[PDB]
Design a protein around this nucleic acid. Structure first.
Ligand SMILES: [Mg+2]
Ligand SMILES: [Mg+2]
Ligand SMILES: [Mg+2]
Ligand SMILES: [Mg+2]
Ligand SMILES: [Mg+2]
Ligand SMILES: [Mg+2]
Ligand SMILES: [Mg+2]
Ligand SMILES: [Mg+2]
Ligand SMILES: [Mg+2]
Ligand SMILES: [Mg+2]
Ligand SMILES: [Mg+2]
Ligand SMILES: [Mg+2]
Ligand SMILES: [Mg+2]
Ligand SMILES: [Mg+2]
Ligand SMILES: [Mg+2]
Lengths: 74, 125, 71, 147, 266, 184, 196, 61, 293
RNA sequence: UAUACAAUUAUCAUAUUAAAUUGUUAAGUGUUGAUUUAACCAAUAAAAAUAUAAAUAAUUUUUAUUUGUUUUUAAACACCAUUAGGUA
RNA sequence: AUUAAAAAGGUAUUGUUGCCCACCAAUUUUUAUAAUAAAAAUAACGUGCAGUAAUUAAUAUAUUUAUAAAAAUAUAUUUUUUUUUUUU
């Protein structure tokens, strides 16, 4: 049984985005700082009061090409 | 699901009578020629969708401009008023409509029904 | 389609529609319109689990609007 | 629609069998396949053959005496618009005489070159590595089997 | 994530924004090099062709009237949809509206059993060439699956550039040597240039820099084709050996040697 | 025994064997003739043939014929082969479009370059380099140049190549045009 | 930092549980491998495992594309050589260097043309690797069983036509002379399989 | 929906200058400018595959 | 070296690798350079003599021609001129081909109110909108573009039909009178020697056995033709050719060579029609089972 | 010894809302013979093309009906045995 | 002055000097005893070399065949390795 060469290291083509999505780091860093035991990085000091946009969702979870996901990149 | 003929998955957001898309005996899908504009071939066609995205347009209201007289005189054709829009529109699918299975799949062979595509022949008019 | 299979309720399927349309991050779902279904809708909109809902006195369906927060 | 009734049958059949009777003063009607078919006289003998078929008709049954059948001619405008039709058709056969083929001038000097380059390809070919399997006999096929 | 066409990860373009030509060329622009400039005008916003089949499987072919004649009694109009042998074209070679395929296979069938079409071959093959879009190698259609034509026109235009290069290299060459009148003790070339560069060298006027030259030219006539008499050793009766000829040592580290290479055919 | 015409043993030559059908003029092949070429005067038939053969080969007809006319294959293996063929075709097309979509960019860069040449030497100069008759003067020079272009543009007939047929031992494919191993 | 995020000190950085159990995969593939050559699972060029991939099957025909070195290959000058051959074959009394000059002029250009095409094609190999190739990550599309799901869809159809019964069944092949050798009462043409 | 790119570059040079990013002042502006000008000649220059654009498990050479 | 093949030449370090570039080739003759330079300059001056732009032009002397352009005749003109050339040119550079065709048409052409119908009139004509778009030629239509037998052979009571059949392991040739009478027997690649107990099967059905066979058959075909025609009273004395229809079974290798061996007989045999009859298997009786299936 | 499957996607044998069934075409004789095959042996060799619409959805067919085994070689190919035949 | 760089499988696991397959003896154990019961443990002897794309690719059904793995044919098929005409 022959496969395409690099399938061992093949990335998850649906979920590989999640890790890097801004909201994630907002939440995590949110409850990390909350402890009192972490010094907030300054980006968090900033986006604290300008949290990112709500309804932009990737094309992986929403399966539509026609959905214009981005207010910016449109 | 790795079984062939089960590949279309579980979709609840369809309009069919089963939530399991692969038992539905109505519309067999076509993996090779389909899904240019809908993304994957499994997913429902644009005009048949029962769930809607945030920044995407939803279904046009069908007519079958006179009535905008009170509006801005300039205002053009409202993007959601469509002359011809059909929720029931049969999209050509080879495994249904052109079915080559009982043949050797040579050039002319396979059984075709013509009742799907609207006739481009001159014979009608 | 056959015997051993579950017998579905327009509650079962109501829920799985909402679930799946929440997973694909859609803003609207079309959903079966019976009594306890739009009952459930009103209750959810009370508790603020759903952005809003409407019944158009369409017979089959009515439509719910989903809410998202922090991505 | 003119329906053939039972009373009118043979009259009509015969009016039809005489459609091409091998002479008339007027232009002849074509086929459903759009051909000018053989003009037979009374009783259905093959008397007049149109030009495209004459070679074969004569080659198959030589003793058959048949004529080339020319259509009756009808003249549009003058011999002037027909001579201008002659100029346009000659210009068509000219643009086609230009586009068709060159072939240089003389044949044998062309054929020489073709056969030569075919030969050159033949012996640039014979130097290609064959497959192991095509090359060897069954002696060492068997040898490698045992081994 | 894939584009539909060839599966690209990006949407194709050449340029996108209004300023990029300006911003890229900026010191040129302040300089005023760019004033009459036609390269920053012509191609500034130029984008790729649409290389796409509006009809992947033609519902457009044939155009309407053709259908009328797709019956059994139109040998010509049957023939414009077959090969020179009479067979149909595979669906993805010459795509046809399914109507046309039905009517066509039916047509050819009827036509044959009535004797109005041959059981093999295309009797209208030449006549039918008008109706076929014969695409001249000289014109370019942006949509082709022909990779040859593309590279052909690439070649053509590049060579058309090279012509210009060469014309203007040899031209000013002939104005280096052709400007020599008062150049003998003239200012046009430095005294030190008289010193160093007035000697024959690889860049100046080499003899030949290459082996296998033409020496000894003469006007003598040609000889007869094949003046030589075939040798006394027969090359014909000798069998050509390839694989087993010399002895080799396998660099195979571990595992059974791949059977497809050694043993598989026959 | 009775064989078809594309069969191996079809036209036999032996003491018993005799050829079937009216064999000349109007013949057994009467309406069964796949191609007809009237030979133009002063034209070698080697061009005629190599055009016919190139035709059949590039449209994969001689492929098909060779294939089916030698040995039997069940409808499953035949399907497997035609569909594999067609799918590899699909793949390679989707490659060609990529190549081409790049090459049209390459050509664009070339044409763009040619424009830059234009505004270095002026348009007319560029034109001169391109074979423009500005020394044309009278019509006779134009006619010499156009007689040049005439003698160029008129096409010599193509000798186009047809790959030979490789006869292997037990003939797994009689479609064999190269020595590469195939998957049957 | 000084280098890639998906490659640490000892090799590829092992994210899924397959790499913690099978950590050969972290550092090895093929013969062409170097330590900087991990995380780029494609190796250099002209090199073992340099080949770019398109829907998973690698691209080994590149030269064949630009029509350098192909059996179908692009041919620059034909009219030339045919003209000169014509002359050579006609007669031996007059000799033509008038043609040979036209021709070798032609070839003299052909050289730089070819270097150009080769160059552009290497640029294509690079562009392709950046913006198209998946680096052997996605399942093959080019063999019929990879499309099995598609075929299934049509088997399903032929079954529901048969009252939802015979899956993957086909009409029994008959005989060459099937119709015309059979007496009345027996099926002269092959039926639907459910209609046996 | 494609704005003009000048404000963007003057901004992105401004940030690197006002942030202390470089020891010698010009380097910020020069590098940012240069890197753009080289990419200007590339086929489909301003689009990028999503996976290779940035840090991810597998990368470009 | 030892029991192995010698490397290709380029696999070795350069033969002349230790000899400096100035030496290969030597540039000698440096003595003559100066001489040939002075020579060429003196020459130039002579070529200047054989034949024998700073004529000061004042701008104020031109004024009349300037006032000529301020009159709106000339500007009506420039406007007309410039509005003609604003039409979106597709040319972009001087192109040789297009020039050629253009002036070709100038040689071909040097050799060469009623009420406007409203939209309503065309609203009532259904036909017209189908005339505008139609493929079908309107006017008297050429008949040779209809008839079935238009492009097809045309035979003669005297023609010889030469059958060249190329098979996989064999090739053979025959001839027939138009009435189907066999002329000479069928010369075969295994009939002529050429085949068995020899070099191999691989080359058995090859190109040059087809050639051998055809060139051997024609050679013998001539005299018996002159005989069969001597019998009926057709002398065919001299300056005669045999009209030939070459029918070819094929797609095998023996085909190519075969027809070539006919082409060289062009001084004797005149080929009117080249038409191949090669059987195509739509479906039919089982072929013999091969190895795999 | 007792002590908590799944119910959103699971490959070997308990099917189920379906439009089919029926079409009489083709092919055949000139003559002295190495065809096919990696290789043997028996020994006339050519051939069998046409159909869409339409049939309504579900609720008591599960002892019913249904899933490539088929008369006629005086018709072949093919296949199996080896010159005798079997089968097709 | 003629050619060569880039696509590939492992039932093994420092890996083909790798592993495995059936018959062919003893024994051990349960039973629903069919040439000579069946099934399971098993480490002799003897025949081979069936399998790992594996020396006529394999897998499933079907029919036949048989020292033993298995082999022939008819279908489907890739848990086998790919080679690619958008009217020429
Ligand atoms: Mg395997
Ligand atoms: Mg691997
Ligand atoms: Mg018999
Ligand atoms: Mg590798
Ligand atoms: Mg069950
Ligand atoms: Mg017991
Ligand atoms: Mg036992
Ligand atoms: Mg085996
Ligand atoms: Mg074995
Ligand atoms: Mg095996
Ligand atoms: Mg098996
Ligand atoms: Mg079995
Ligand atoms: Mg056995
Ligand atoms: Mg078995
Ligand atoms: Mg088998």
């Amino acid at each position: 049984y022959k496969m395409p060469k690099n399938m061992g290291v093949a990335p998850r083509f649906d979920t590989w985005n999640e890790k890097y999505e801004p909201w994630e780091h907002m939440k995590r860093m949110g409850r990390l700082v909350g402890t009192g035991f972490y010094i907030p990085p300054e980006w968090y000091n900033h986006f604290r009061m300008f949290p990112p946009i709500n309804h932009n969702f990737q094309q992986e979870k929403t399966l539509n090409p026609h959905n214009a996901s981005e207010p910016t990149q449109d | 699901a790795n079984h062939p003929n089960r590949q279309s998955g579980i979709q609840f957001l369809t309009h069919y009578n089963t939530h399991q898309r692969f038992r539905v005996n109505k519309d067999y899908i076509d993996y090779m020629h389909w899904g240019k504009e809908q993304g994957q071939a499994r997913l429902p066609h644009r005009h048949q969708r029962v769930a809607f995205d945030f920044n995407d347009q939803l279904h046009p209201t069908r007519i079958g401009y006179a009535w905008f007289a009170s509006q801005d005189p300039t205002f053009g054709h409202h993007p959601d008023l469509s002359s011809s829009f059909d929720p029931n529109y049969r999209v050509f699918s080879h495994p249904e409509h052109w079915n080559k299975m009982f043949t050797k799949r040579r050039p002319g062979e396979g059984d075709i029904d013509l009742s799907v595509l609207p006739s481009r022949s001159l014979l009608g008019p | 389609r056959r015997r051993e299979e579950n017998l579905y309720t327009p509650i079962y399927d109501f829920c799985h529609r909402i679930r799946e349309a929440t997973e694909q991050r859609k803003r609207f779902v079309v959903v079966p319109s019976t009594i306890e279904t739009r009952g459930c809708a009103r209750v959810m909109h009370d508790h603020g689990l759903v952005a809003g809902f409407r019944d158009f006195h369409n017979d089959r369906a009515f439509a719910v609007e989903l809410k998202y927060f922090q991505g | 629609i003119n329906y053939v009734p039972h009373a009118q049958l043979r009259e009509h059949i015969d009016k039809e069998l005489d459609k091409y009777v091998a002479g008339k003063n007027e232009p002849y009607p074509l086929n459903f396949v759009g051909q000018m078919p053989f003009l037979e006289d009374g009783d259905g003998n093959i008397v007049e053959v149109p030009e495209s078929l004459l070679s074969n008709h004569m080659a198959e049954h030589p003793d058959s005496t048949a004529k080339p059948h020319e259509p009756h001619t009808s003249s549009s405008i003058s011999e002037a618009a027909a001579f201008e039709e002659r100029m346009l058709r000659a210009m068509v056969s000219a643009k086609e005489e230009d586009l068709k083929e060159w072939l240089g001038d003389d044949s044998r000097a062309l054929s020489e070159t073709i056969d030569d380059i075919s030969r050159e390809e033949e012996e640039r070919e014979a130097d290609i590595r064959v497959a192991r399997s095509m090359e060897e006999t069954d002696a060492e096929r068997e040898v490698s089997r045992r081994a | 994530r894939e584009g539909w066409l060839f599966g690209q990860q990006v949407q194709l373009h050449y340029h996108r924004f209004p300023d990029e030509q300006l911003i890229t060329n900026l010191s040129r622009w302040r300089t005023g090099e760019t004033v009459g400039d036609i390269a920053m005008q012509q191609f500034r916003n130029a984008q790729p062709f649409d290389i796409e089949d509006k009809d992947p499987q033609g519902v457009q072919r044939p155009s309407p009237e053709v259908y009328m004649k797709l019956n059994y009694k139109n040998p010509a109009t049957i023939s414009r949809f077959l090969t020179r042998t009479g067979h149909m074209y595979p669906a993805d070679i010459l795509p046809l509206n399914p109507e046309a395929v039905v009517k066509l296979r039916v047509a050819k069938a009827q036509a044959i059993r009535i004797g109005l079409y041959p059981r093999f071959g295309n009797p209208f093959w030449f006549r039918s060439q008008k109706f076929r879009p014969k695409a001249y190698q000289e014109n370019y259609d942006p949509t082709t699956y022909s990779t040859k034509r593309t590279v052909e026109h690439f070649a053509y235009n590049w060579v058309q550039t090279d012509r210009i290069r060469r014309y203007f290299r040899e031209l000013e060459a002939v104005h280096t040597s052709g400007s020599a009148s008062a150049r003998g003790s003239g200012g046009g070339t430095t005294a030190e240039h008289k010193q160093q560069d007035q000697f024959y060298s690889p860049e100046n006027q080499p003899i030949s820099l290459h082996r296998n030259n033409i020496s000894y030219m003469e006007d003598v006539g040609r000889s007869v084709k094949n003046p030589t008499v075939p040798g006394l050793m027969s090359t014909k009766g000798m069998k050509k050996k390839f694989h087993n000829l010399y002895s080799s040592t396998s660099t195979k580290r571990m595992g059974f040697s791949n059977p497809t290479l050694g043993i598989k055919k026959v | 025994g009775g064989y078809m015409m594309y069969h191996r043993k079809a036209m036999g030559t032996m003491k018993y064997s005799k050829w079937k059908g009216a064999h000349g003029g109007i013949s057994h092949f009467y309406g069964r003739t796949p191609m007809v070429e009237e030979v133009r005067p002063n034209e070698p038939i080697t061009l005629v043939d190599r055009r016919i053969m190139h035709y059949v080969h590039h449209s994969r007809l001689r492929h098909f014929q060779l294939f089916r006319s030698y040995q039997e294959k069940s409808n499953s293996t035949e399907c497997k082969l035609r569909e594999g063929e067609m799918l590899r075709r699909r793949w390679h097309r989707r490659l060609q479009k990529s190549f081409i979509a790049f090459m049209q960019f390459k050509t664009m860069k070339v044409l763009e370059d040619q424009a830059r040449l234009v505004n270095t030497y002026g348009q007319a100069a560029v034109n001169a380099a391109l074979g423009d008759p500005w020394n044309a003067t009278d019509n006779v020079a134009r006619e010499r140049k156009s007689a040049a272009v005439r003698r160029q543009v008129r096409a010599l007939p193509m000798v186009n190549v047809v790959p030979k047929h490789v006869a292997t031992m037990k003939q797994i494919h009689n479609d064999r045009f190269n020595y590469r191993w195939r998957v049957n | 930092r000084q280098h890639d995020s998906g490659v640490n000190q000892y090799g590829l950085k092992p994210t899924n549980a397959y790499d913690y159990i099978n950590p050969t995969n972290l550092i090895n593939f093929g013969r062409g491998t170097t330590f900087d050559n991990l995380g780029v699972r494609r190796a250099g060029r002209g090199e073992i495992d340099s080949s770019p991939s398109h829907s998973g099957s690698p691209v080994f025909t590149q030269a064949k594309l630009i029509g350098l070195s192909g059996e179908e290959q692009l041919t620059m000058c034909q009219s030339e050589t045919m003209a000169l051959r014509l002359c050579m074959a006609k007669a031996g009394k007059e000799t033509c260097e008038r043609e040979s000059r036209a021709l070798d002029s032609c070839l003299g250009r052909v050289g730089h043309l070819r270097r150009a095409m080769s160059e552009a094609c290497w640029e294509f190999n690079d562009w392709f690797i950046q913006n198209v190739s998946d680096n052997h990550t996605k399942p093959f599309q080019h063999r019929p069983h990879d499309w099995r799901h598609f075929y299934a869809q049509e088997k399903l159809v032929r079954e529901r036509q048969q009252n939802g019964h015979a899956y993957g069944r086909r009409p029994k092949q008959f005989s060459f002379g099937a119709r015309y050798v059979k007496t009345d009462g027996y099926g002269k043409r092959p039926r639907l399989p459910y209609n046996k | 929906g494609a704005a003009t790119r000048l404000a963007g570059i003057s901004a992105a040079a401004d940030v690197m200058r006002r942030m202390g990013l470089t020891r010698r002042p010009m380097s910020s502006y020069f590098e940012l400018y240069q890197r753009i000008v080289e990419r200007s000649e590339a086929m489909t220059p301003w689009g990028f595959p999503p996976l290779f654009q940035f840090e991810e498990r597998l990368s470009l050479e | 070296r030892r029991g192995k093949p010698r490397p290709r030449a380029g696999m070795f370090p350069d033969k002349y690798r230790r000899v400096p570039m100035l030496l290969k080739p030597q540039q000698g003759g440096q003595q003559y350079f100066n001489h040939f330079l002075i020579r060429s300059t003196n020459d130039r001056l002579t070529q200047q003599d054989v034949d024998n732009f700073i004529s000061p032009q004042l701008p104020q002397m031109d004024w009349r021609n300037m006032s000529a352009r301020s009159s709106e005749e000339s500007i009506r003109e420039e406007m007309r001129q410039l509005a003609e050339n604003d039409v979106m040119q597709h040319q972009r550079v001087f192109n040789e081909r297009m020039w050629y065709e253009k002036e070709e048409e100038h040689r071909m052409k040097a050799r060469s109110p009623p009420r406007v119908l409203g939209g309503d009139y065309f609203k009532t004509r259904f036909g017209y909108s189908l005339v505008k778009n139609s493929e079908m030629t309107q006017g008297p239509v050429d008949y040779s573009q209809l008839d079935m037998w238009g492009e097809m052979p045309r035979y003669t009571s005297d023609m010889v039909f030469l059958y060249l059949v190329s098979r996989r392991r064999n090739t053979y040739a025959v001839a027939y009178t138009y009435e189907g009478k066999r002329i000479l027997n069928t010369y075969t690649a295994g009939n002529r020697g050429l085949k068995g107990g020899d070099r191999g099967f691989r080359s058995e059905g090859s190109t040059d056995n087809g050639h051998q066979v055809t060139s051997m058959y024609l050679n013998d075909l001539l005299p018996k033709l002159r005989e069969m025609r001597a019998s009926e009273g057709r002398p065919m004395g001299r300056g005669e050719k045999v009209e030939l229809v070459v029918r070819v079974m094929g797609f095998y290798n023996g085909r190519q060579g075969a027809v070539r061996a006919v082409q060289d007989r062009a001084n004797e045999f005149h080929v009117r029609y080249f038409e191949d009859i090669t059987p195509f298997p739509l479906n039919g009786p089982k072929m013999p089972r091969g190895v795999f299936k």
